[PDB]
Design a protein around this motif. Structure first.
Motif, PDB file in Angstrom:
ATOM      1  N   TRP A   1     -30.346  29.576 -53.360  1.00  0.00           N
ATOM      2  CA  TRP A   1     -30.050  28.422 -52.524  1.00  0.00           C
ATOM      3  C   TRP A   1     -31.353  27.808 -52.030  1.00  0.00           C
ATOM      4  N   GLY A   2     -31.434  26.482 -52.075  1.00  0.00           N
ATOM      5  CA  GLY A   2     -32.620  25.793 -51.607  1.00  0.00           C
ATOM      6  C   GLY A   2     -32.353  24.873 -50.436  1.00  0.00           C
ATOM      7  N   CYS A   3     -32.897  25.216 -49.271  1.00  0.00           N
ATOM      8  CA  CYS A   3     -32.748  24.397 -48.069  1.00  0.00           C
ATOM      9  C   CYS A   3     -34.013  23.563 -47.911  1.00  0.00           C
ATOM     10  N   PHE A   4     -33.955  22.310 -48.357  1.00  0.00           N
ATOM     11  CA  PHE A   4     -35.107  21.411 -48.347  1.00  0.00           C
ATOM     12  C   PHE A   4     -35.131  20.672 -47.013  1.00  0.00           C
ATOM     13  N   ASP A   5     -35.762  21.282 -46.014  1.00  0.00           N
ATOM     14  CA  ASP A   5     -35.913  20.622 -44.727  1.00  0.00           C
ATOM     15  C   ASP A   5     -36.862  19.435 -44.842  1.00  0.00           C
ATOM     16  N   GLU A   6     -36.620  18.427 -44.004  1.00  0.00           N
ATOM     17  CA  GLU A   6     -37.422  17.204 -43.981  1.00  0.00           C
ATOM     18  C   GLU A   6     -37.469  16.554 -45.364  1.00  0.00           C
ATOM     19  N   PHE A   7     -36.290  16.413 -45.977  1.00  0.00           N
ATOM     20  CA  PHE A   7     -36.207  15.794 -47.295  1.00  0.00           C
ATOM     21  C   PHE A   7     -36.645  14.338 -47.265  1.00  0.00           C
ATOM     22  N   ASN A   8     -36.309  13.612 -46.200  1.00  0.00           N
ATOM     23  CA  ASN A   8     -36.680  12.207 -46.094  1.00  0.00           C
ATOM     24  C   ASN A   8     -38.173  12.000 -45.876  1.00  0.00           C
TER      25      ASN A   8
END
Ligand SMILES: Nc1ncnc2c1ncn2[C@@H]1O[C@H](COP(=O)(O)OP(=O)(O)OP(=O)(O)O)[C@@H](O)[C@H]1O
Ligand SMILES: Nc1ncnc2c1ncn2[C@@H]1O[C@H](COP(=O)(O)OP(=O)(O)O)[C@@H](O)[C@H]1O
Ligand SMILES: Nc1ncnc2c1ncn2[C@@H]1O[C@H](COP(=O)(O)OP(=O)(O)O)[C@@H](O)[C@H]1O
Ligand SMILES: Nc1ncnc2c1ncn2[C@@H]1O[C@H](COP(=O)(O)OP(=O)(O)O)[C@@H](O)[C@H]1O
Ligand SMILES: [Mg+2]
Lengths: 97, 1544, 281
Positions: B420-427
């Motif tokens: 699982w990949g939690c990409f924080d601050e994607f924007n």
């Protein structure tokens, strides 16, 4: 003591949300209650014909959008906004009822 | 171009093949091929090293042919190695999380597993190491960081499968299997614990201790889900008596057992298991109550289907598929990945809502996108769901460098592993990069969708998405999550195609009341509901009532910090009570201790330890009123840290600081230091906010040393200025071509600590970010400051923050930092009242009495001097009262207390040096105590006047002088009207006027208006002495004033009295970067490796380098209010050095100081300097000379010039009046409000006198009318050339006639002021006036020759052209004479310049700009011109157009060239040697013998100044001119501006 | 072939896909081309000096921003996509997008659920025009929400009715639909307590067993005393016919808002038309 009996316009204050806390603190300190157990009751009356007890604070300038308050009761109306004459913010103990 | 590539390829392949001695066992065929290549390389070295000549080896045949074969062989084996890496990565896909270099390390170290133990962190969720027997051949089990271990049911040996991948595959399979088998046993035991009226605490605790923290919580969830499902099934009949009450009863009785267990002392591992079980069982109790209240009687009702249900099937053959987790219609299988002991989350309604929405998205085979403000619980909820399903969740802190290639490899790694990949601050990604990523996410999702189709079979080809032009297998467990904070600064906008790929969810209002109640309940707090109902409203009221400050944060993170601190305090209080119970008596009862525990007092202590330190002075009473109101009847008094306070006393005394307790002086500072210590204990990320000069740096420096002498742990601090270097240099860069990661500054520091070659984890490491904070660089630390304590890099590398490392920021404000960064760091507020003025005065006196100034008679002078100023350095003394009044005046720059005090201390240090020089000059009669008393007392007033009012106009200098005279007792000058600022303090100890130091000199006739000739005035002598005092102390200084006021002239005049200082001129512009300073450092200084570190010192030994920055406030501020070069300069002034980005090594400056010059910050294009930079630099205001001064300055110049013609000597006085009056009127009439170039200064007067002098030099005799004509002509060429409107030119023409007639009454008007005023040395040898008709005929003949030899375009000659060619000819006959021609295109600006250049013999050079022209080509063109005009002595008229500027870099190099005559960074490397060869050859041709490179460059610079002329042509744009006044300031003060305009 | 523009490799794929398609005759789409305004000018020059296959088509999805080159706009046919003008137009767009075979399936009550979904989606989406009153902020209630809602209806209706031709209205999982629509599909974008309260009011009013009665009112007191009536049909064609017969007199009372909510907006737009008509004189 006089500062309690004045009616303020919540729109005319830089931080109106601070006034609600200040009134909440004043009522609790006067009655030796606790801050977390006070709830807000609102009673709309005329500006001239109103009496403020130890827990009621007058607020002016509040505008009711799309409704009319008669005898502290709302009714749907076609007016864009209706100006509440005077609002009494009364702090009372929570009942959880 | 082939030898270098083969050499490099062999070097890293040899190291790979030599470091990994076991690589041949898996790569047999290429090892033999490399051995042949190695044999060839050995043969190559044995042949080419014999002859160390390129000519001796180029003639040998078979070298290039074998080189091409070697290149093909090296590429082929490298490709085969690459094909081998991906093939091996295909098996055991966890290798996609390790780098290629790391992977080869695993490949070559298969024999020894000790080196392999450091990598299991980054392939497994919680497996930190593997347990092996004494033989290191059988893997018994796995372990976590906390010490918890899992023992394999069937141990995986390594002997049966030496292949690192195969046995690494089996341990992963065994870990999943042994976790499934252990869970199956655990649920069996907890089923017995369930469906029971009473639970024995001894049996329950034993079961908790038996199994892992992951399996005990899972077993409880499975048992409850089955119990409710069975109860609902029995109640399916409808209208039946409810056994669901028994399920609720079973949860409550088990909760009571758990609640009593946490009350007593437990082992730390068991305590965490106890807390996790309480958190889950509280959730189960709440859910069961909801089911009972809603009267749910059907197992298929949505009130039960919406809840997360666990189903265990013991009949299933596959243990991995035994457990199924279902929510709504979504079904998941437990991954059985060992997560270790993670921190669970109170399952608040929002967390449940998060679970439902995220699981709905996963069922639809698309990712989830929880969004909202920071602190709500997005990343933790995403991680908690992944840990709930037993998945491997990777947290990535996305930022702008996560380009398309970087994200693709991350997606490839996730797809193969099935993580699982939690990409924080994607924007935070670029909008274009967000769009490109949407293709990869779409491709993965479509592959997942076809995977879920029932038609597909595991036997059928596995689903493979195309990622990065390759077929990548997609595991069904693969998932993407992207947390985001919309509306935050530094964040982009997600494209609509990307947004439709994710199921968004608003995470805005976390349930704070529930999160607290459960957290306090699980920590053993009785009446946790009462505390929760008090602490959560308290934080809501604090957010409302308290003032809005940029560093305030009262969100969930703050409440969490308090709750964790509340648990720590209660444990400490229990231990303290227990230690009291053992010493006094012997009765210990844990039940009694928990009973009479002031839980409210504990909660207030945590609030005061966490919330109070960040409060401003005005907000402290409000919070304490809230605490007393919310928590009535209870009070908390902070503990007196006496053990640390004694250490603070010793450290402060040894660093000459002031220490105080409570209300004593220095008391507030010590409390701030103690608050900083408490924040350090509970937070791994700190910030010290507060105005500049509030004692922040001294707070953490003293704390570091105090902790070192108290705990015995050595403290190491790495101070980094984040904004002084680019973000690429701070964190690192990833090569877009070779995908090679070069470590930045912070990454190198953090990686070095983690590796700890020299025992780094055993020392207290504090990484201090002393610089401005903006969301561009500080959000890359979000995952570091968050619980993840992880630094994620674009290359997929993740660095865990060690427990002994603290990330601290020292900032003055947080008006640009986002709420995400503010909530991630404990805040300590240092108000200016913390560091009182008495506190600084004591520090200065203590250092004066202790540290000798020379490096003792010097110290004795300081001690005697310090005692004399002691009465004046007290509270409400002379200095404090003067400082308070000085704040009420108006200064050219913002006034700060430390800037005034910093200047004052430097002057008083010079006073002590002056006394020693007097003693050295008078050995027989040393200066006595009485004379020293008079000298110091008077110098103190003199220093006070020039420090608190140095940067103010004359009126404010008089006002402070008048105020001082009213309050001081020091004897003052008795002049009724002359201000005190007009007097100096003689070394004998009496006041002496500055007028005695100013003589009426007679300048030599040949030195009239020379660049190095200064006529002394009152303002000149005062500033020269002031600059001498500051320059002798090597303190950086900044001169502020309007252009042409005399800032550069005063500094150079002051520097002439210092023979050990060499000035280097730097011309800053709006595009200036620290690279400009670094290029100067390379040319004038050198790096040497002293034992103490790298030191940068000037090449000239014994000489101090003075870097003179011409326009220090011009460099552009970014959108976050920071100038990078100013932050760079501030670092090298405060810290005495900078960071070399080549190898991230601290370089310490030696024998270097800075001097700044700038226009007032109110001028257009000028930005106010930062308060942290102005603290170190005194500012002196050099204003325009007055009318009396101008008459004196240029009256001397005119008298010397008119000595050429004795008949005109009587007109020196009226002529000077004429020039002064007309210049004053033109300065008043034309201002910068009208046009940007309307700048009039004494520079015009100096050009005026020089213009008249050059005209009068060859003439033997000239009448008064002739002198007026020359005076009138020079006025037109200076004040009328730059005028824009025709009415302004008419104003100048009329007033020239009026001014001349007023001061020269009896003259011939028509003979002296005939309107066609033309002067030229073309018709004759001298610069005599010329007739228009004769000039036109001469130009006609010369133009005819011009057509034949040069450009053949015909020209129409009119009066303006004749005027323009004369003006251009005037500039071309001057040293460093550059032109700026402004007019409409096609007006002949270039064709006239070429014609005049051909007339004067100059060679016209124009850069041939094409589409592919770039910065490198312009530099080559510039270097060709400099070489021609500096080495070959060829006069060149460099003609450049505005359209030739294709980049801001084009102007910057021209900006330096125009002012200095040489670009410091233009000639570097091999070509610098060739330039020196030509410079030496050119000097030989002229006749000078030059040996050192230093003197050759000065000769080259002088030649370029004398020869090169730059003609700049541009269109007359309104806004374009204003922009050019800032990006290239040298265009408007080094170039003569001519406004050709359109044809009249 | 669909390519997302914005990266260096994306430009190479776009060039290769166009070059292959002009000869083979396939279709090529490029998404978010407004993020590469400089490359768009190069694309326009390449397209002009080109004679592709007869069946070749190029699609350039973009956001309406001024960075798009003017030459590209003139060289291509422009289609503006936006929320439909009214409730009638929004429902017609919803029914056309949904395949006919999807609505007509094993349970005959599936058609009615899609109509309620179409009506609910229309009411929610057209309250966004009166942003301060209809909602509290400009939520992105888009086609993605409708697709997720339709999948939820398909999933739960099939779960409850195992291929049966008819399912009783009381047996329809109303709670399953109402909770998921208010917490996952449409409630995900809602970040306010009062907006969530409003969203729950619409779902509870619409998605209930009484929606299958003949006296169900979609809206009340639209004008005077008339109210919108629930259609009595049971097939998809009947519901689409009812939508086409809407009075074309939409007022904010259709959405529940007061009739004067559009008074300011219609005045401003009417004044704006005058300025637009005056600016091109
Ligand atoms: N306890 C103390 N006793 C005496 N002098 C002190 C004490 N603490 C600080 N000072 C003095 O006050 C000043 C504090 O400088 P310091 O760099 O620590 O402040 P700062 O607020 O961190 O500065 P900046 O914001 O510019 O980084 C120095 O002149 C220092 O000598
Ligand atoms: N349900 C919860 N129970 C307890 N703590 C929580 C919960 N949700 C979030 N937190 C806490 O909130 C803090 C910040 O994490 P989080 O809010 O997820 O960060 P972000 O907003 O950046 O995603 C952490 O201390 C985390 O443990
Ligand atoms: N006391 C003085 N004696 C002689 N010349 C002066 C004096 N004061 C000012 N000047 C003239 O003023 C000019 C100062 O220009 P400069 O110092 O270069 O301005 P800035 O430092 O603002 O760039 C010099 O050319 C100088 O001739
Ligand atoms: N005084 C003039 N008489 C006749 N033609 C002129 C004159 N000045 C310029 N030109 C024309 O302008 C052309 C050159 O323009 P140029 O000087 O390069 O423009 P700019 O001054 O903007 O650089 C020549 O071909 C010439 O014919
Ligand atoms: Mg500091």
């Amino acid at each position: 003591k006089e500062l309690k009996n004045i009616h303020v316009c919540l729109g005319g204050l830089f931080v109106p949300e601070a006034y609600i806390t200040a009134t909440r603190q004043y009522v609790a300190q006067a009655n030796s209650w606790s801050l977390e157990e006070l709830c807000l009751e609102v009673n709309v009356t005329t500006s001239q014909g109103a009496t403020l007890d130890a827990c009621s604070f007058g607020v002016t300038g509040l505008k009711l959008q799309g409704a009319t308050c008669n005898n502290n009761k709302l009714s749907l109306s076609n007016a864009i906004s209706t100006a509440l004459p005077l609002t009494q913010l009364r702090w009372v103990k929570q009942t959880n009822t | 171009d082939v030898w270098i590539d083969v050499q490099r390829r062999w070097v890293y392949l040899e190291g790979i093949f030599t470091g990994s001695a076991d690589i041949k066992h898996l790569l047999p065929v290429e090892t033999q091929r490399f051995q042949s290549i190695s044999t060839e390389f050995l043969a190559l070295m044995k042949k080419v090293s014999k002859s160390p000549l390129v000519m001796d080896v180029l003639n040998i045949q078979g070298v290039q042919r074998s080189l091409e074969r070697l290149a093909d062989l090296l590429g082929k084996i490298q490709k085969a190695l690459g094909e081998y890496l991906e093939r091996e990565r295909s098996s055991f896909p966890r290798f996609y999380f390790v780098g290629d270099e790391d992977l080869l390390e695993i490949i070559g170290n298969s024999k020894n597993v000790a080196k392999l133990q450091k990598h299991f962190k980054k392939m497994f969720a919680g497996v930190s190491s593997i347990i092996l027997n004494e033989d290191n051949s059988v893997v018994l089990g796995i372990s976590s960081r906390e010490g918890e271990e899992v023992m394999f049911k069937t141990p995986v040996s390594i002997t049966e499968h030496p292949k690192i991948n195969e046995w690494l595959t089996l341990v992963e399979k065994e870990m999943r299997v042994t976790l499934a088998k252990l869970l199956a046993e655990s649920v069996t035991e907890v089923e017995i614990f369930g469906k029971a009226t009473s639970i024995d605490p001894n049996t329950y605790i034993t079961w908790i201790d038996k199994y892992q923290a992951q399996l005990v919580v899972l077993s409880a969830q499975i048992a409850w889900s089955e119990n409710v499902e069975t109860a609902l099934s029995s109640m399916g009949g409808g209208g039946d008596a409810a056994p669901l009450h028994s399920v609720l009863s079973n949860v409550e009785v088990t909760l009571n057992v758990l609640a009593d267990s946490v009350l007593m002392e437990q082992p730390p591992l068991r305590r965490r298991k106890l807390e996790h079980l309480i958190t889950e069982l509280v959730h189960q109790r709440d859910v069961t109550r909801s089911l009972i209240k809603s009267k749910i009687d059907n197992a298929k009702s949505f009130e039960w289907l919406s809840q997360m249900r666990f189903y265990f099937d013991p009949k299933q053959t596959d243990v991995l598929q035994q457990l199924s987790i279902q929510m709504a219609n979504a079904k998941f299988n437990y991954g059985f990945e060992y997560l270790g002991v993670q921190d669970k989350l109170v399952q608040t309604p929002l967390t449940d809502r998060c679970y439902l929405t995220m699981t709905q998205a996963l069922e639809a085979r698309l990712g989830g996108s929880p969004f909202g403000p920071a602190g709500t619980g997005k990343t933790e909820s995403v991680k908690a769901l992944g840990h709930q399903l037993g998945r491997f969740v990777l947290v990535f802190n996305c930022d702008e460098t996560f380009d398309f290639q970087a994200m693709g490899r991350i997606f490839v790694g996730l797809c193969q592993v099935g993580a699982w990949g939690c990409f924080d601050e994607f924007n935070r990604l670029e909008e274009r990069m967000l769009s490109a990523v949407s293709q990869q996410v779409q491709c993965i999702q479509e592959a997942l969708r076809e995977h879920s189709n029932p038609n597909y079979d595991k036997t059928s080809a596995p689903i493979t998405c195309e990622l990065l032009n390759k077929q990548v297998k997609v595991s069904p467990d693969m998932a993407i999550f992207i947390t985001m904070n919309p509306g935050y600064a530094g964040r982009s906008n997600l494209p609509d195609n990307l947004k439709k790929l994710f199921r968004s969810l608003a995470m805005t209002k976390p349930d704070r009341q529930l999160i607290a109640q459960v957290m306090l309940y699980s920590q053993g707090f009785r009446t946790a509901e009462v505390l929760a109902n008090k602490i959560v409203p308290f934080f809501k009221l604090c957010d409302e009532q308290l003032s809005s400050q940029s560093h305030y944060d009262f969100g969930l993170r703050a409440l969490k910090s308090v709750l964790v601190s509340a648990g720590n305090v209660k444990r400490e209080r229990i231990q303290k009570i227990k230690r009291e119970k053992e010493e006094r008596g012997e009765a210990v009862d844990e039940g009694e201790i928990a009973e009479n525990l002031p839980e409210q007092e504990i909660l207030i202590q945590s609030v005061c330890e966490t919330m109070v330190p960040k409060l401003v002075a005005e907000d402290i009473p409000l919070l304490f009123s809230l605490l007393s109101d919310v928590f009535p009847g209870v009070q908390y008094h902070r503990g007196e840290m006496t053990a640390l306070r004694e250490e603070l006393k010793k450290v402060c005394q040894e660093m000459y600081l002031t220490y105080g307790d409570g209300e004593e002086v220095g008391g507030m500072w010590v409390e701030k230091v103690l608050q900083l210590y408490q924040i350090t204990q509970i937070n791994h990320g700190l910030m010290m906010v507060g105005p500049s000069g509030s004692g922040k740096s001294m707070a953490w420096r003293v704390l570091l040393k105090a902790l070192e002498r108290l705990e015995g742990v050595e403290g190491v601090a790495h101070i980094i200025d984040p904004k002084a270097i680019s973000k690429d240099h701070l964190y690192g860069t990833l090569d877009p071509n070779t995908r090679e990661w070069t470590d930045g500054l912070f990454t190198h520091v953090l990686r070095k600590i983690i590796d700890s070659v020299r025992g780094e984890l055993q020392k207290r490491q504090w990484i201090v970010f002393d610089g401005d904070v903006d969301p561009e660089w500080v959000e890359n630390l979000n995952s570091v400051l968050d619980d993840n304590k992880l630094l994620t890099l674009p290359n997929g590398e993740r660095l865990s923050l060690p427990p002994n490392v603290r990330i601290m920021f020292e900032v003055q404000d947080l008006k640009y930092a986002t709420l995400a960064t503010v909530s991630r760091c404990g805040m300590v507020w240092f108000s200016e009242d913390v560091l009182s003025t008495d506190m600084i005065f004591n520090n200065f006196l203590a250092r004066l009495r202790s540290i000798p100034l020379d490096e003792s008679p010097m110290l004795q002078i300081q001690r005697d001097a310090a005692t004399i100023m002691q009465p004046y350095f007290t509270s409400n003394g002379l200095v404090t009262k003067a400082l308070e009044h000085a704040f009420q005046l108006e200064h050219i720059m913002d006034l700060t207390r430390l800037r005034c005090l910093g200047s004052l201390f430097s002057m008083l240090h010079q006073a002590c040096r002056n006394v020693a020089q007097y003693n050295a000059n008078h050995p027989d009669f040393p200066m006595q105590i009485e004379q020293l008393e008079r000298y110091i007392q008077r110098y103190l007033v003199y220093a006070i006047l020039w420090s608190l009012s140095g940067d103010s106009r004359l009126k404010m200098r008089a006002e402070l002088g008048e105020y001082i005279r009213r309050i001081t007792t020091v004897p003052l000058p008795t002049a009724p009207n002359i201000p005190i600022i007009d007097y100096e303090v003689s070394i004998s100890g009496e006041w002496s006027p500055w007028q005695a130091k100013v003589p009426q000199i007679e300048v030599e006739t040949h030195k009239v208006a020379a660049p190095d000739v200064v006529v002394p005035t009152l303002d000149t002598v005062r500033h020269e002495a002031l600059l001498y005092t500051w320059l002798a102390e090597h303190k950086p200084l900044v001169l502020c004033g309007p252009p042409g006021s005399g800032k550069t002239m005063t500094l150079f005049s002051a520097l002439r009295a210092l023979p050990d200082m060499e000035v280097v001129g730097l011309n800053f512009s709006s595009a200036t970067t620290p690279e400009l300073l670094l290029k100067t450092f390379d040319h004038y200084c050198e790096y040497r490796r002293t034992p103490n570190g790298v030191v940068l010192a000037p090449v000239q030994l014994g000489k101090w380098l003075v870097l003179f920055c011409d326009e220090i406030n011009l460099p552009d501020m970014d959108k976050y209010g920071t100038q990078r070069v100013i932050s760079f300069i501030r670092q090298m002034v405060e810290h005495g050095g900078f960071y070399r980005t080549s190898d991230q090594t601290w370089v310490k400056l030696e024998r270097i100081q800075f001097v700044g010059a700038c226009n007032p910050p109110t001028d257009p294009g000028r930005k106010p300097l930062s308060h942290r930079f102005l603290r170190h630099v005194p500012v002196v205001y050099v204003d325009y000379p007055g009318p009396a001064s101008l008459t004196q300055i240029y009256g001397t110049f005119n008298r010397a010039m008119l000595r050429l013609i004795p008949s005109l000597r009587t007109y020196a006085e009226p002529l000077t009046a004429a020039m002064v009056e007309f210049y004053t009127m033109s300065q008043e009439r034309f201002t910068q409000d009208t046009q940007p170039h309307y700048i009039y200064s004494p520079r015009e007067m100096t050009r005026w006198v020089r213009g008249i002098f050059e005209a009068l030099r060859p003439l033997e005799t000239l009448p008064v009318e002739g002198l007026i004509r020359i005076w009138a002509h020079e006025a037109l060429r200076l004040f009328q050339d730059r005028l824009v409107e025709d009415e302004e030119r008419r104003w100048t023409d009329e007033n020239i006639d009026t001014v001349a007639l007023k001061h020269f009454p009896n003259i011939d008007r028509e003979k002296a002021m005939s309107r066609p005023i033309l002067y030229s040395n073309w018709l004759s040898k001298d610069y005599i006036p010329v007739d228009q008709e004769e000039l036109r005929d001469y130009v006609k003949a010369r133009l005819k020759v011009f057509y034949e030899e040069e450009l053949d375009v015909p020209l129409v000659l009119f009066n303006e052209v004749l005027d323009h060619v004369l003006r251009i000819d005037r500039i071309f006959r001057q040293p460093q004479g550059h032109l700026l021609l402004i007019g409409v295109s096609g007006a002949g600006k270039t064709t006239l310049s070429r014609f005049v250049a051909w007339m004067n013999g100059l060679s016209v050079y124009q850069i041939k700009v094409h589409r592919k022209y770039t910065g490198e080509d312009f530099d080559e063109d510039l270097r060709t011109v400099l070489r021609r005009s500096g080495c070959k002595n060829e006069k060149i008229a460099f003609i450049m157009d505005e359209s030739n500027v294709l980049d801001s870099g084009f102007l910057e190099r021209m900006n330096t060239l125009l002012a200095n005559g040489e670009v410091p960074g233009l000639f570097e490397g091999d070509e610098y040697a060739t330039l020196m060869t030509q410079c030496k050859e050119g000097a030989q041709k002229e006749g000078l013998m030059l040996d050192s490179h230093e003197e050759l460059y000065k000769w080259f610079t002088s030649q370029v100044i004398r020869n090169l002329h730059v003609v700049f042509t541009m269109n007359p744009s309104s806004e374009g001119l204003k922009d050019r006044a800032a990006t290239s300031p040298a265009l408007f003060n080094r170039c003569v501006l001519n406004w050709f305009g359109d044809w009249s | 072939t669909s390519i997302a523009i914005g990266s260096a490799e994306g430009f190479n794929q776009a060039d290769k896909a166009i070059n292959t398609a002009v000869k083979s005759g396939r279709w090529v789409m490029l998404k978010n081309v407004h993020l590469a305004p400089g490359w768009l000018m190069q694309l326009e020059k390449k397209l002009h000096s080109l004679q592709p296959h007869a069946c070749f088509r190029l699609f350039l999805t973009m956001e309406i921003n001024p960075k798009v080159p003017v030459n590209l706009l003139r060289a291509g046919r422009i289609f503006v996509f936006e929320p439909p003008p009214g409730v009638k137009a929004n429902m017609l767009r919803t029914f056309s997008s949904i395949p006919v075979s999807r609505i007509c399936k094993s349970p005959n009550e599936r058609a009615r659920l899609y109509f309620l979904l179409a009506w609910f989606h229309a009411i929610i989406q057209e309250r966004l025009r009166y942003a301060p009153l209809g909602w509290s902020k400009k939520y992105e209630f888009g086609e993605s929400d409708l697709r997720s809602a339709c999948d939820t209806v398909d999933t739960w209706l099939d779960d409850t009715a195992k291929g049966r031709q008819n399912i009783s209205p009381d047996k329809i999982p109303w709670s399953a639909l109402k909770t998921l629509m208010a917490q996952s599909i449409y409630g995900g974008r809602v970040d306010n307590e009062f907006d969530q309260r409003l969203l729950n009011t619409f779902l509870e009013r619409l998605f209930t067993t009484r929606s299958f009665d003949s006296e169900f009112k979609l809206a009340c007191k639209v004008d005077g005393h008339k109210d919108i009536q629930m259609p009595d049909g049971i097939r998809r064609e009947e519901f689409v016919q009812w939508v086409e017969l809407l009075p074309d007199t939409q007022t904010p009372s259709w959405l529940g808002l007061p009739n004067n909510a559009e008074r300011v907006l219609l005045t401003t737009q009417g004044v704006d038309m005058i300025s637009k008509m005056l600016k091109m004189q």
